[PDB]
Structures are given as C-alpha cells and as structure tokens.
Amino acid sequence: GIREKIKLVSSAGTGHFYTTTKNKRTKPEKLELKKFDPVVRQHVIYKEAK
Amino acid sequence: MLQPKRTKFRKMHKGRNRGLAQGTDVSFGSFGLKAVGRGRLTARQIEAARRAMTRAVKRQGKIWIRVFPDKPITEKPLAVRMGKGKGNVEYWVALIQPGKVLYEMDGVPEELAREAFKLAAAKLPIKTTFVTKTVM
Amino acid sequence: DKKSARIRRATRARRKLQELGATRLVVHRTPRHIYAQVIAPNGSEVLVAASTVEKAIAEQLKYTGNKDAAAAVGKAVAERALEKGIKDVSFDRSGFQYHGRVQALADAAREAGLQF
Amino acid sequence: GGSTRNGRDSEAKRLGVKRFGGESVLAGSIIVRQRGTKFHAGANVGCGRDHTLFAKADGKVKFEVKGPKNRKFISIEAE
Amino acid sequence: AKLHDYYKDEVVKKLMTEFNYNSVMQVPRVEKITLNMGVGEAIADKKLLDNAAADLAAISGQKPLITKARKSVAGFKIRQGYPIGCKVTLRGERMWEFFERLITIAVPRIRDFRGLSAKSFDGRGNYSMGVREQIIFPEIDYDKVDRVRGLDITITTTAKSDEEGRALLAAFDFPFRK
RNA sequence: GCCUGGCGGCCGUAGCGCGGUGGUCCCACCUGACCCCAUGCCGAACUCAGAAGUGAAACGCCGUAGCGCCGAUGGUAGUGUGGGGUCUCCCCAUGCGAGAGUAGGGAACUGCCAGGC
RNA sequence: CAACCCGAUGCAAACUGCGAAUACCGGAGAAUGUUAUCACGGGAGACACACGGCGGGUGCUAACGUCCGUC
RNA sequence: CCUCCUAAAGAGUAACGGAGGAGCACGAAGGUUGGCUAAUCCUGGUCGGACAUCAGGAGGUUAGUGCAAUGGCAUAAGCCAGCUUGACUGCGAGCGUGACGGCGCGAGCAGGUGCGAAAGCAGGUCAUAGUGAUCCGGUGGUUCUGAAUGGAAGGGCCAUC
Ligand SMILES: [Mg+2]
Ligand SMILES: [Mg+2]
Ligand SMILES: [Mg+2]
Ligand SMILES: [Mg+2]
Ligand SMILES: [Mg+2]
Ligand SMILES: [Mg+2]
Ligand SMILES: [Mg+2]
C-alpha cells in the first residue's frame, strides 16, 4: 500500500470535499488543484493533502 | 541420442497422427527408406537403425535422416495414483506416418543399401520399403 | 520527403473531420502559390475553389503566395462559397502551421462571411 | 506442479452480427483489447475505454474492410 | 561567405569540367560541418562537460547541444538518459566562416601533420575527421584550459559519392596528402 | 484529349528494383532572412520576403519482369448426413471442398475541381 | 568450429503471410406441426449418473479408468 | 482476481491438466494542443572500447508500451514539449454479462471547466488483475426526524473511515 489516502477540501467555506490518494513520501508538498463542488455550483481551488 | 536442444514448452500434449506424410519422394540422397505404415520412432530407435545402417555402407556414401523426435511423451512412475500433474518427459518420440521418408542413402550401389536399409528397417517398429529416387 | 511528413502530420484531423462528416475548407500552400477548395463530406466532389493560379485573382496580385495574396484568396473562397450557399464549414490547415499565409485566407475568409 | 489458476468469462465477442435491428445503441462487438480486431466506423463508433465497438444511431449493421491495410471496420447503415 | 564565394567562383566550374556535370546542380555542394566532441565518462564529474561544451562553443559560435545517452546498453554506464555529448552542426555562413577558421589557421596550426589522411570516403563525399586534441584555436586565453579535448568534424557534402567527394573540398587547399 | 496540382475512391495485377524521359504553366529544389514564426544546436525542419539558377535530387510519366503481388483447371487434405471395416485409424454413397503447387495474369484502374497547351 | 543470409526438407495445444465442413446469429418465404414458443403465477422433484458413437485433456491413443464438449 | 492453451472457427466447460502473473504504480505516467518516429547492421569519424556521442546508407511496427500474457497500436495507445485539472457534479436512450448480490460499455441532456484559431477532444491511465458484501460504529454536512412543548441525545439522508 503505502499510498496514503487524502481528502481535498473546498477552498470555499463550503464543507464539500473530494477524496483521493498520494505518496506521502516521494512528494512532500500537499496537493492543491481546484475542482467543482455542487454546493457553490462553481469551480474552485481545493487544498489539504498531507 | 537425439532431441531438441531447446523447447518453449516442457510438455507436448498428445494428439494423434492423421495419415499421409509430407516428405514423400527423396530430395537429398538417391534411395532412402519409406513409411508404408503408421506409428512413432522412439528416437532411441532412429539411432539403433542409423548405426546398423551406417555399419555396412561403412564409411563410403552419405546418409540422411528426414525424421526427428521433438515430441516429449511423458511416463508416470510405478506406485503413483492418477491426477498429480502430468508425468515427466521420459523419452522423445518422432511422429511419422505412411509416406515419411525415414532415411536416405546416396553414395553407394543400389545393392549395398537395399541390403543395408533392409538391415536398418528391422530395428524400427513401423513397417517400411525401399525407394529409388523418382525423376520428376 | 518534406511533403510526405507534411501529409501524415495532418492525416489525423483529415479523418476526424471525415468522422464528423462536415464540409471542409482545404488549403494547400506552395513556395509560389496558395490554394483553397471546399470539398463536400464525401470528400469526392468539390463545391467551390478559389486559388492564386487563377488569372482573375492573380491579375490584381503583387505576387502569388504573399500572405496578402493568401488572403484575397480566402475571401474569394468565401465570396464564391456563399453565393453557392455553403456557409459554415470546417477549416483543414492540412499539415501547414496555422500562422502565416494560412492564418490568413482562413480568417480572411472568416471575416469574409464563412462561419468556423 | 505449481500450475493452475485462470481468468474467468470476460465473454468478449460480436453480439450484433451482420445487419441487425441495431437498437439506438446496441453492443455489436465487445471483444475487448481489440482496437483493430474490429474498428469503429460510420453511424456507429464510440469504441469505449475497453475498445468496445459502441454502435450509435439505430439500424442495420455493415461489417466491412477498407484502407489502412485491410482493417475490419464496423459501420451501421440505416434500414 | 568569404570561402563561400570561392565555391560559386573558381570552384564549381572546375568541378563542372571535372566530369562535365549535366547541370549547375550536379555540382557536389559542401553541406554543413558537424563537430561532436565525445564527452566520455561524464558520470564522474558531470562538470568538465559543461566546460567541454563551452569549449565546443569556443569554436562554433552556435550553442552546443549536450547529447544525451540512448539505448542505455552500456558496459560503460549509460542509463538511457544522462549527458554525454555536444555535436553542433554547421550552417551556411557559420558553415563557411568556420571553414575559414580551419584548413587555414587550425589544420595548419598542426602538431606534426605530415599529410592528412585523404581516407574518409563513404558514398556521399561524407568526410569526417577527429582533431585528437583541442588545437588551441582561438578559445579564451587558452592556457589554463582543461586536460586535452579533441572532437569530430564531418563535412557531409551533397557529393553523389566519394567518387566525387575527394574532388570537391579539394577546390580549396584541403591539407590531405599525396 | 494530353500534361500538372489539390481532394478522394479502391489498397500490392496498385509495391520495389532497373533503364529512359519532363520545367517560369504546375511542382519542386532554389535566393535572401533583421524580421512574423522556429532550432532542447542549426532558416535542416517549421516560417516570412522572393530574384537569379536547375530538373541534379524529389516528384510525375514511359518502358523493362529481376523480385513482390494476383492466380485458375485437375487432383489431393479435411468435413455435415447415411452406412461399413476397425486395437489408437480408415473405407463407401452423397453434399461441401481446402492449403500448397502448376498454367497463366501482371509495370493499376477511376471520380470531382483548378491551371497550362 | 560455427552466427546471420540463400537455396532445398520436416514439426507445433500455448506458430499463422492461408483456411474449410459446419455450428451459431439475423432477414425472407412455402408447407407441416393438436401454438411446439414467450411471460406471470400454484405444486414439484432433481443437483451420486452409466454405457455407446464423435472431438479431446489425463493415463500406457491401459482399464467395465478418470475429467470436459456433443448426440 | 488477471493472461494464454485445453475449448470441437459465436458464448460457455472439467481435471491434484500445461504455463505465468495480481493484493499495485502515477498530480503526472491524467487532459488537451503542436510537433516527432524505432531495433539492428554496414561504412566513415579524436580520446570511443563488440556496444557511449557524430555522419551517411541500409532496414521498416525485428522497437516501444510503468509490471504477466493475449489482443492492439503510425490517425499511433509509442516519444517530446506548452498550457492545464474532464481523475469534474447531477443524470442517462440503449445494451452486454450474471441464479442472485452485483460488474461492465455507453451516445446524449443540465451546470460548470481545461486545451485548440476551429471542427473538436476530455466523466483518468492501450484494454483486460491491483480486491471485501453486511453489521457495529467513527468523522463532516443537512433545520428530514426528534416519545408533553422548545431544545438536545439518538435516528434518517449525502459524503466518507
Ligand atoms: Mg464451435
Ligand atoms: Mg451436490
Ligand atoms: Mg455431481
Ligand atoms: Mg458427466
Ligand atoms: Mg466410465
Ligand atoms: Mg468460443
Ligand atoms: Mg496497462
């Protein structure tokens, strides 16, 4: 395994979030890369990824 | 004493001969030994036949072997139940059928050959017959 | 061959457009001339075609294949392909890099009326 | 020994041979892996992720063979 | 285009009559020098090469093209990628301005030279040659420098064949030998 | 109608080799390049502005069968149904009928638009 | 001594530049068939099969052997 | 669980039959756009050695696909680079495949994105393995419920461990 799980929270105050994984080791920095949360009905940045 | 130096697969299935060979008429020497029967050469025979064959023509003349073993054929030991994976390749058989020109003589009288093959094909299981050379 | 690589370099689009089945505007370039013809979906028959090797056009031309030349053409292509009715099509740069004399005659045909 | 195991069904094959009623979007030819065992063409294409010859607008099936060195190619003519 | 002019000048006509070439096109034209300078090792330092490159640039003004390994199959090393070269072909003006840098003040700036091997034939006037050592040609205060250097030099002329290659290139005092 | 270019249709009887031939119409190579645009170096390619030069290369056409390639007729192999001989294989009636090989064929054919005579 | 390559010769369940019979799918049509066909619902039993023909794996192309397909 | 054969040219099939693989990897190795095209050998070239790099010729999927095998790939699904987050959300005509639970393919619609001049392509990777039903709970959201009323605990619904 090793490929730890990760959750992408919406930059917007909204609580909606996305889910995926990433190699905690190799890549130190946490993943940030936008998406679309139904709530705001608009695309937006998504942070948090160990 | 004659087998494939290498095989992509360790064990060949089984199958069965379906008559009519391909290497009929001679195409190397000038005589040869034909099939006339169906069966398989234990390969250990082709030599027993070849050896005796040679030993007569002595040195003189060129000999041929248009047949080859290549086929595994396994054997399961004595005390051993059925269904334990296929057995192990004990020997190597050579599938031949009516027509296959077993061997082929060339540099020798049609006398010191007709009575060299006749001497040869007497070690083999499958019946045989002498062959000339056929013009066309 | 320089010409060979060219063809294969656009064989894709020149198939994807086919897949769609839409009248396309084919443009062919050359050191001294500029060509433009609007072939039908079947790719067999050509509906309209205005080029620089045509007396009429070339007549009022400074030099064939001079961007300005590869512009008046596209317009004439539109002019023709419009009186004929053919409006709104698909541009097939065909190997050549949409940028110069091709980025002309194309938009010189766009503004000319053709939709794409 | 150490030999056995084996995959499963994975059916894969033509399910719309020759001209068929060809629904609005039948299967036609699954045979996965196949990008070239059968190619997408005509009023049908798709060629899903698993290379499943889609089959668009309803109609008879064709099954041809054209350009790029033979090539199968499946297309559907309307009835 | 100094030496360049000479071509279309006294040259050509000479080669023309050389074998009554059917056209002023069937005249083998000098087509780009190539250069290369095999990096070698590299892995050891991966520094001297960035220099060796700057050295390759010393001659040809054009920026060196650090050639990367390929097949990877190397008892030497080579891991598919990894740095290992600096070719830099020669184009027109620089192709002749450089062909005005040597065969005059480089090849002549010998080290012994008793006759340049006129043996580099192939089937297209293709002539290549190694210098064995940076002839110290107009580098930069060429004294500190670095251990040896050397490199390669191909001509790649449009010669129909080395059965003509030799002829051309000779239209200019090409070292060679008898 | 002949020749050339553009897009196709069919994809090797359409391909390759070999010998010949065509040029300010077309096509190319070709000239110049600070520039538009471009080289992990290079105006080579991509690109622009175009003279002067040449069909050399490329491309097209013509011929040539060396090689690809197409390929009968006959027989052979196999096989569905019915029957029969029979130790793992065949045979007969009947319908289907290869593959290879042989005779031979063969140096593509064609539609639409444009340009030149 | 022997690699590649050329010519001539064989072999292959996990080789194929070839390729059937035929089985299967679909469309049309006549005739025959006590709708044989499909769907929904009440009731089941049955999931130890055996031999024989054909195509096979396994076994020794051994077994009234064993394991599949098919009648 | 995946691949090939057995498997008799649709599907499907057995054995303690013959062979191998998976319990992952990737924020790029995904998307798009522009461009590119191998192995191998021959000859020539400083150090270059059978085999580094350069030149020319031959050759033509004999290379390359992140990992098995099979099928497939030049319009490349191979290789390079620019900009990027479609590895989006709600749905889904109609199918394939299953005894079932379930798994798979999917054009097109709505809202919003990225790349392209545009037609257009993108709901993850050439495809087929890379997985665990239910329960019991954990976390976040929601005014659905809330045992006299208002709240709350707990429960539901959606996301998820
Ligand atoms: Mg079958
Ligand atoms: Mg039971
Ligand atoms: Mg049972
Ligand atoms: Mg049974
Ligand atoms: Mg029994
Ligand atoms: Mg099947
Ligand atoms: Mg994969």
Side-chain angles (χ1 to χ4, degrees):
Chain A
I2 90 98
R3 276 276 279 191
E4 255 157 283
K5 295 187 177 196
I6 279 309
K7 50 274 188 172
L8 277 60
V9 187
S10 182
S11 74
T14 167
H16 169 295
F17 68 113
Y18 269 103
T19 168
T20 183
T21 60
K22 153 263 202 58
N23 191 317
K24 181 63 173 181
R25 267 234 303 289
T26 65
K27 323 307 281 294
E29 73 293 86
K30 54 154 55 43
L31 176 64
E32 330 180 7
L33 78 169
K34 320 147 70 59
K35 254 142 182 52
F36 161 70
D37 65 332
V39 275
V40 191
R41 299 146 298 175
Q42 305 290 302
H43 260 87
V44 73
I45 298 80
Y46 265 67
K47 226 79 74 70
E48 201 278 343
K50 292 198 292 81
Chain B
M1 260 296 120
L2 199 92
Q3 72 193 196
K5 280 253 75 288
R6 148 163 46 268
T7 39
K8 254 57 265 161
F9 287 118
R10 285 287 316 297
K11 312 177 179 174
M12 221 181 109
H13 257 170
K14 204 173 190 314
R16 46 219 61 185
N17 307 76
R18 299 313 306 196
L20 309 322
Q22 298 323 315
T24 309
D25 49 1
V26 319
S27 303
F28 293 97
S30 70
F31 294 123
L33 244 181
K34 202 99 155 303
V36 186
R38 314 185 88 289
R40 40 179 66 172
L41 307 184
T42 326
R44 190 190 276 275
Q45 317 175 308
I46 76 91
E47 281 290 335
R50 185 198 64 71
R51 293 175 213 303
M53 174 182 304
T54 285
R55 181 188 194 75
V57 201
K58 277 120 177 178
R59 181 205 74 178
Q60 342 154 307
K62 183 131 179 175
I63 314 86
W64 270 275
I65 302 181
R66 289 239 264 172
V67 293
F68 200 63
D70 83 58
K71 184 160 166 73
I73 301 298
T74 74
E75 287 235 300
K76 196 169 284 293
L78 285 181
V80 52
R81 313 118 113 188
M82 311 283 282
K84 302 291 183 179
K86 207 172 183 297
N88 352 68
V89 284
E90 230 51 285
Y91 53 93
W92 288 86
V93 107
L95 261 57
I96 67 175
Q97 44 275 79
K100 275 293 173 173
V101 51
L102 294 305
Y103 309 78
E104 224 162 298
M105 198 109 291
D106 174 60
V108 87
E110 69 299 313
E111 188 57 284
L112 204 296
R114 182 169 235 94
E115 224 279 341
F117 277 148
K118 177 187 291 293
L119 221 187
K123 308 285 185 176
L124 311 182
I126 307 77
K127 31 280 172 191
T128 47
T129 195
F130 195 87
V131 173
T132 311
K133 188 168 66 185
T134 295
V135 191
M136 187 164 78
Chain C
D1 181 34
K2 340 295 173 184
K3 216 71 173 189
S4 299
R6 175 176 82 78
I7 287 187
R8 89 98 203 296
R9 193 205 280 90
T11 301
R12 192 165 184 180
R14 279 220 193 170
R15 195 62 55 193
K16 203 286 131 66
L17 272 66
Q18 179 226 198
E19 159 194 341
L20 306 178
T23 56
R24 65 152 184 271
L25 170 61
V26 195
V27 59
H28 187 274
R29 192 259 295 295
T30 153
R32 251 78 184 185
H33 280 67
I34 309 291
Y35 302 110
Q37 49 190 302
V38 182
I39 309 166
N42 50 71
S44 163
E45 40 183 351
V46 189
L47 309 175
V48 297
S51 52
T52 45
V53 77
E54 263 167 59
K55 190 241 173 202
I57 296 169
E59 279 293 71
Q60 32 270 208
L61 222 312
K62 176 193 188 307
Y63 173 49
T64 48
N66 183 228
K67 190 185 276 69
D68 302 290
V73 176
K75 172 155 167 290
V77 179
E79 306 287 50
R80 265 81 104 64
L82 222 43
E83 194 193 11
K84 247 279 191 171
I86 312 303
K87 176 172 181 295
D88 182 82
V89 292
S90 293
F91 190 79
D92 175 11
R93 81 192 197 297
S94 312
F96 312 105
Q97 177 179 66
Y98 181 100
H99 140 280
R101 321 217 299 277
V102 195
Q103 191 174 56
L105 113 89
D107 52 359
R110 175 225 66 179
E111 186 183 318
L114 251 53
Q115 232 92 311
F116 68 93
Chain D
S3 275
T4 170
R5 295 88 74 192
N6 200 358
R8 224 69 201 180
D9 276 43
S10 292
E11 327 303 358
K13 197 48 146 66
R14 333 95 35 151
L15 323 157
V17 293
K18 103 109 155 59
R19 73 84 152 179
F20 254 25
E23 200 30 55
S24 297
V25 60
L26 290 178
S29 159
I30 277 205
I31 298 181
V32 201
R33 340 314 185 209
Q34 148 247 68
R35 147 176 184 51
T37 299
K38 293 302 182 309
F39 253 93
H40 42 307
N44 114 251
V45 260
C47 173
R49 311 178 48 272
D50 73 313
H51 312 304
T52 294
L53 269 307
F54 183 107
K56 267 84 172 301
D58 35 291
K60 309 244 174 304
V61 195
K62 195 53 189 287
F63 260 117
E64 286 165 315
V65 50
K66 268 70 182 64
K69 188 193 68 171
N70 186 308
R71 284 275 199 276
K72 265 56 179 287
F73 278 102
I74 298 179
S75 35
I76 52 177
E77 305 168 302
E79 37 212 45
Chain E
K2 327 170 180 182
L3 212 301
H4 174 38
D5 298 353
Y6 192 2
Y7 183 77
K8 199 272 170 195
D9 275 352
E10 295 197 351
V11 186
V12 180
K13 304 191 204 79
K14 207 287 150 290
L15 274 143
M16 270 294 318
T17 60
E18 160 265 5
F19 187 56
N20 191 58
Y21 287 134
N22 302 271
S23 174
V24 67
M25 214 64 70
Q26 235 293 310
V27 281
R29 331 132 92 283
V30 175
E31 172 56 291
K32 127 227 184 176
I33 286 72
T34 330
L35 310 174
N36 176 55
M37 179 187 279
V39 145
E41 308 294 307
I43 173 76
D45 236 14
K46 308 173 166 306
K47 301 153 66 182
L48 65 156
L49 307 323
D50 212 316
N51 302 176
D55 275 306
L56 208 297
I59 305 79
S60 52
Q62 12 274 59
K63 176 186 175 175
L65 175 78
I66 169 180
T67 85
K68 278 68 191 303
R70 191 244 291 168
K71 186 155 58 255
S72 195
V73 178
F76 315 105
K77 170 59 73 168
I78 301 181
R79 291 146 304 175
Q80 195 69 36
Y82 139 105
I84 190 52
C86 45
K87 42 145 56 192
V88 187
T89 51
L90 284 310
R91 18 287 173 167
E93 204 293 324
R94 304 97 108 69
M95 200 237 287
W96 284 301
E97 183 272 315
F98 162 70
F99 200 38
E100 188 69 336
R101 279 289 68 66
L102 74 329
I103 202 187
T104 301
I105 58 176
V107 177
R109 203 310 199 188
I110 75 173
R111 333 75 216 156
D112 181 76
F113 194 98
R114 198 70 184 166
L116 196 48
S117 178
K119 305 141 60 182
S120 173
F121 11 81
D122 299 308
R124 192 76 170 192
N126 355 45
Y127 265 59
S128 312
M129 59 152 286
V131 310
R132 304 196 176 293
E133 170 187 291
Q134 201 262 155
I135 87 111
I136 316 300
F137 36 19
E139 182 254 326
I140 307 92
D141 351 292
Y142 13 110
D143 52 68
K144 340 82 163 301
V145 306
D146 254 42
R147 132 270 307 90
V148 298
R149 256 309 173 295
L151 50 72
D152 279 61
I153 300 174
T154 304
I155 274 57
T156 329
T157 179
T158 82
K160 87 163 203 316
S161 67
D162 40 306
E163 185 194 340
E164 296 189 344
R166 20 59 170 270
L168 184 266
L169 203 68
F172 336 108
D173 193 289
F174 202 79
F176 278 150
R177 183 65 286 144
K178 192 181 68 180

